[PDB]
Design a protein around this ligand. Structure first.
Ligand code: NI
Length: 341
């Protein structure tokens, strides 16, 4: 049974709620972005409207095979009427095609649903700046002060350097990057760009990337592995036994892999900076963990909420235990007292 934090009051609208069957009263099903926890349930047999971004639309049509008519894509940054309710989609700074959604209720209430987001100061000069937001449905993935991590630009720097160093030192080494969903494309695109290569990948991953409206994408990616010196592999596969396995398949063309595992937070963020990172090493294979986050840090979230001064906050992440719920409320109360709203 659909939880109350996936419903929008005063509408027939639900958000990311595709796994409960038909939801009685729901005229419209919004999907914030193409990540399986959010889309769990969709298929070719869905005959209700889905409102989403164009890119999310492309992924629905091509990867899940939903029928063109039941996908309603919308442009971003554009006031749009949807069953006689004004809505806007806003860039969420999460993965490709990920959006936040502003709902303007007839009664005068204004609700922001963040989907998954990495909060940023550029959002403070968006359409959100123009009016009061009464309710906030919030991505609380990292709502605790331990959760610090570097900027994406800091991390891309490290990467571009590690990779380019080694390739110029040993020109028969391979760069690998791990992946399992959309997101974090900048990691491999940046490495390939500095090495003068295309990124090589499976047919299924090539298919996914060709739906993302990345400019000049035909010049950046290929399904020909042999021709390329940056390769993508399943994240499950980014380990010694599996990298060994893969190092065979290339057939005497490379004598060293240098892998990267972009991950979220891990407990070594609490004691080690980004300039001072190391890999695990079992012979000629070296696996880097690098903390490229597409979710708000604690400080980023805090700043965004304190600027927004919402009258009410409804968490969408870590809401399954009373302890987490209670911990989160305490932070929201601190923030509001500091800020005077
Ligand atoms: Ni996500």
């Amino acid at each position: 049974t659909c939880p109350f934090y996936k419903k929008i009051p005063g509408t027939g609208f639900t958000v990311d709620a595709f796994q409960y069957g038909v939801v009685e009263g729901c005229t419209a099903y919004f999907l914030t972005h193409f990540h399986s926890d959010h889309y769990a349930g969709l298929s070719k047999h869905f005959t209700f409207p889905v409102y989403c971004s164009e890119i999310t639309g492309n992924l629905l049509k091509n990867k899940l095979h939903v029928q063109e008519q039941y996908i309603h894509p919308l442009p971003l940054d554009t006031e749009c009427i949807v069953n006689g309710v004004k809505v806007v989609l806003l860039d969420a700074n999460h993965c490709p095609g990920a959006v936040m959604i502003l709902f303007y209720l007839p009664n005068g209430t204004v609700i922001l649903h963040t989907g998954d987001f990495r909060a940023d100061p550029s959002m403070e000069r968006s359409l959100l700046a123009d009016q009061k937001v009464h309710m906030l449905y919030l991505d609380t993935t990292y709502c605790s002060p331990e959760y610090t991590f570097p900027s994406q630009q800091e991390v891309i720097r490290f990467a571009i350097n590690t990779a380019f160093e080694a390739v110029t030192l040993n020109p028969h080494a391979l760069v690998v990057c791990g992946t399992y969903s959309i997101g974090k494309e900048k990691v491999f695109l940046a490495i390939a760009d500095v090495l003068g290569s295309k990124v090589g990948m499976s047919q299924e991953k090539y298919k996914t990337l060709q739906c993302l409206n990345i400019p000049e994408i035909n010049s950046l990616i290929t399904t020909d592995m042999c021709s390329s010196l940056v390769h993508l592999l399943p994240m499950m596969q980014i380990n010694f036994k599996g990298l060994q396995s893969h190092l065979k398949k290339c057939g005497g063309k490379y004598n060293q892999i240098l892998a990267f595992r972009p991950t979220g937070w891990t407990h070594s963020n609490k004691f080690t900076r980004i300039a001072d990172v190391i890999p695990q090493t079992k012979g000629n294979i070296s696996i880097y963990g690098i903390p490229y986050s597409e979710h708000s840090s604690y400080l980023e979230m805090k700043r965004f909420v304190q600027w927004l001064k919402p009258q009410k906050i409804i968490p969408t992440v870590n809401v399954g235990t009373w302890k987490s719920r209670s911990t989160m409320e305490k932070y929201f109360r601190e923030w509001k007292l500091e800020a005077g709203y």
